[PDB]
Amino acid sequence: GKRQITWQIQKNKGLTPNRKKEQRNPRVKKRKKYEEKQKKLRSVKAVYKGGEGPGGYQGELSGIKTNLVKSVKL
Template sequence: MSSLVNIYSIDFDDDSASGQRSITRAILANKGLTPKRGKSVRNPRVKKRQKFEKAKRKLSSQKAVYKGGISETGRYDGEKSGISKVVKSIKM
């Protein structure tokens, strides 16, 4: 177990002239040109859920998706996925 501890202990202020030089912090944290990644990349379940929600929004903008007929009140308020009031055209 003590050999594992010695592997990961790095002395940054070692000024000994004999032997190999110790690595610097820049070399230790050498990441190169990696792009910045968001927090969702660390949790694949969250990333897939966000991807699914994005796909649902994209699909609902392309075609009518049924959203249910009876609301929480229990009475019929008209169809939720009927004619939308969103204008998707551009006025010239």
């Protein structure tokens, strides 16, 4: 038989802009940002990422380009 105070007034949120759960937990943000920045790393240079698979050599799985040199010219 009493008027309960609702959650907005119980914590005066107001008009703050909306954020994400990745932003709400500061560890997860630095997990998701790191995995994304690890993904970008494989797109510029290359990572070893294991040797030949257990199945054996199945060809250079993504293309061979002839006119491309990638050595650091001393």
